[PDB]
Each structure stands twice: as C-alpha cells, then as structure tokens.
A paper describes a structure:
Human factor D (FD) is a self-inhibited thrombin-like serine proteinase that is critical for amplification of the complement immune response. FD is a single-domain serine protease that has a unique physiological substrate. It converts the surface-bound alternative pathway pro-convertase C3bB into the active convertase C3bBb. A salt bridge between Arg202 (Arg218) on the self-inhibitory loop and Asp177 (Asp189) locks the S1 pocket and rigidifies the exosite.
Here, ensemble refinement (ER) of FD and thrombin crystal structures is used to evaluate structure and dynamics simultaneously. Using ER, we detected a highly flexible state of an FD variant [[name] (R218A)]. ER modelled a large number of alternative conformations for the exosite loops, with root-mean-square (r.m.s.) differences in amino-acid positions of up to 6 Å. Different crystal-packing environments of the two copies in the asymmetric unit showed different amounts of disorder of the exosite loops, as indicated by large displacements of the exosite loops 1, 3 and 4 in the first copy and of loop 4 in the other copy. We initially observed an unfolding of the N-terminus that did not account for the observed electron density; therefore, for subsequent runs of this data set a weak harmonic restraint was placed on the Cα atom of the terminal Ile. To assert the consistency of the ensemble model, ten parallel simulations were performed differing only in the random number seed used to generate the initial velocities. The ensemble repeats show high real-space correlation values between ensemble repeats, the majority of which are greater than 0.95, with a minimum of 0.60 around the exosite loops showing high flexibility, demonstrating the reproducibility of the ER method. Release of this conformational interlock results in increased catalytic activity towards artificial peptides and displays a distribution of inactive and active conformations of the catalytic site (60%:40% active:inactive conformations of the catalytic triad, in contrast to the 100% inactive conformation observed in wild-type FD). ER of the FD [name] mutant highlights increased exosite dynamics upon release of the Arg202–Asp177 (Arg218–Asp189) self-inhibitory lock, revealing a highly flexible state reminiscent of an ensemble of conformational states traditionally described as the Na+-free ‘slow’ form of thrombin. The dual role of Arg202 (Arg218) in FD self-inhibition and substrate recognition suggests that the conformational dynamics of the FD [name] (R218A) mutant ensemble may represent a highly flexible intermediate state between the disruption of the Arg202–Asp177 (Arg218–Asp189) self-inhibitory lock and interaction with binding partners.
Numbering used by the authors: 1 to 228
The structure:
Amino acid sequence: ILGGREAEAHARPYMASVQLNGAHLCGGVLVAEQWVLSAAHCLEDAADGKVQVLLGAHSLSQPEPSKRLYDVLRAVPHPDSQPDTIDHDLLLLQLSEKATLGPAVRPLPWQRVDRDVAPGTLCDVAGWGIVNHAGRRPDSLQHVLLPVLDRATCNRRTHHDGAITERLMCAESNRRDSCKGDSGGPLVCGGVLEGVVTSGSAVCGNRKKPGIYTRVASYAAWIDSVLA
C-alpha cells in the first residue's frame, strides 16, 4: 500500500489470491464457480507451477473458516498476450472443483456489453501488495475507490502517450506518494466487474499518474468461450 485501506473481511466474496508455491503472486476474481480471472503477466515466465488459488480469504496468513486453497486444472492466458506489451493481459484459471459458495465465496457478475465505463465513475479495486512488501506483505485485503479517467486524457504524452487502446481503461492513480497494483486484481463498478489490473502504474511518477486496467467487456467473447 500507499493507496488505500483495509477491506471489510469477506465483503468481497469474489476476491481471489493467485499463488505461486504458496505465496501470493497476483490478485484475481471469481467469475464462475470453477473459474478465476487474473492477468496473463502474473503466471508469465516459465518453470512451474503449484499455481493455486486462495478463496474466501481476508488474511493471507491467519486461520479463517472460509479459506480454501484450490489447485488449478488449467491456466489459460489470452492467446494474444505478450511479455513485452500490456495488451490482451488476461488469464483464466480453472479450479480443481467448483468453489464451495457462501457468504465469503461467491462469483461476481462481469460486464458482457462492450461499452466503456463512464469517466468519473467511482470504482473499487482490491488486492494484497508485491515482492514481499513486508514479508506477510500487506497481510489482509486492502481496497480503494478510484474515479475512472477518460481514455483521451489517459493517453496524454505525459500520462500514457497513446498506449491506451479501446480494450483498456484507466483510473486516476494516486497523489501524495506512490503505488500499488496487486496485479491481476479487479476493478469493480456498481457491483460489476469492469476491469483487471495491468502494470499500470509500474512506472510511477507524476501527480495525475493513471492505473491501467484491461476492460473485461472487450474480451467477453474470449472469456465466455473458454468457459464453454
């Protein structure tokens, strides 16, 4: 963190921790009983494995009755994802079994209609912090409300300089100091999944630095198809 606050425990029952070898790698979002959406860059690299997903968690380290760790039957990165690009940066993970659903675990509706989130809309992003930003990292789930930034301005020569295609969206990042982006994590507007974090901003510095998110509606055809 240097954006935000501790979330209410289990009030985002869609939130997932994508894990490598039992350590938090990336955020993700439960989009169907057996399927979690995250970002391709997360699981990018090569060797392995023991990629799993933790559902029903608030703390990454402490006992909680709802916590369940799922192995993954299949990792499906968007075919057009590339290591050297923030395009098509989505990742679907098929869980070993249907998630057991309840107050702490519950898929989130996601936007199928390909329309942009209106600029100014307040959306919610949640996650758990990187490298080991404090060994247990941030240990409990954090979130913050960010206003959506118009694509035009996001594309300014000082913001993101034409990088933001119509398949991407932006949020004002955060003034005062810097940064965040769990990655793979979700951007939720009015209770609907609209975006997934991409390395926006992993080049942090300005005042009006914006976060970059992949628009899930733009990939609705690919998502649904992997699900069927």
